[PDB]
């Protein structure tokens, strides 16, 4: 658990530092320096928007790959004694990849809303552009993380389904319903991302 120890140490140190820093800023009357407004505002909307698109695609692909390996290991292991698994349970892989297809679709939809400003002063950048960056970032987070979780869930369920099919052929047809239910979550994330970026306009 060396790497987990390192991560836990970093987390604890960072958040102890944050606690003491917040106590200092509040108590020493230096709160006006902790300008979250200035952070969110000076930080360019392009950073948020492009991080959002990148996350939308990358996390969707991460979930698709996670599920694909989770279920393909089981498919190939079971098929050593019952090769029909390879031909039948490719549907789990298909779902895990539909996750990434949703990811790219939403990356396209988000990227279609990008446009330069030609301004640097926040009053010039305006609510429209700032909210556009924030909402593209949020939509990317939504789609990417929902797709990641849906892909992992479908992969786990598909590994289970492949293992169960390796022993009795008539079970996969009934266990695919769990895969469908797990797939619905990616669709929900896509719908929410689309709603978020519905009225988004950079320029």
């Amino acid at each position: 658990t060396g790497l987990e120890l390192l991560y836990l140490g970093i987390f604890v140190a960072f958040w102890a530092c944050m606690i003491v820093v917040g106590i200092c800023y509040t108590i020493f009357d230096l709160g006006f320096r902790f300008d979250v407004a200035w952070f969110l505002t000076e930080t360019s909307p392009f950073m948020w928007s492009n991080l959002g698109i990148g996350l939308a695609i990358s996390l969707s692909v991460v979930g698709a790959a996670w599920g694909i390996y989770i279920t393909g290991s089981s498919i190939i292991g079971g098929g050593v004694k019952a090769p029909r698994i390879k031909t039948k349970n490719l549907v789990s892989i298909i779902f895990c990849e539909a996750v990434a297809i949703y990811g790219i679709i939403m990356a396209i939809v988000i990227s279609n809303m990008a446009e330069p400003f030609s301004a640097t002063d926040p009053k010039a950048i305006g609510h429209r552009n700032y909210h556009a960056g924030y909402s593209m970032f949020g939509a990317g987070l939504t789609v990417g993380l929902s797709n990641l979780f849906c892909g992992v869930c479908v992969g786990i369920v598909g590994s289970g389904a492949a293992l169960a099919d390796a022993q009795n052929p008539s079970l996969f047809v009934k266990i695919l319903i769990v895969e469908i239910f797990g797939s619905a979550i990616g669709l929900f994330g896509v719908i929410v991302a689309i709603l978020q970026t519905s009225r988004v306009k950079m320029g």
């Binding site: 539909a98 297809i101 319903i177 469908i180 797939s183 619905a184 669709l187």
Partner: peptide, 25 residues
């Protein structure tokens, strides 16, 4: 034997599958 509940569940699964499949395909 005819099981109405199971038939309804099967048709619901088929309809959900086809409708989500249109979009996903």
């Amino acid at each position: 034997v005819f099981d109405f509940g199971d038939t309804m569940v099967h048709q619901a699964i088929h309809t959900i599958e086809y409708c989500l499949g249109c979009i996903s395909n």
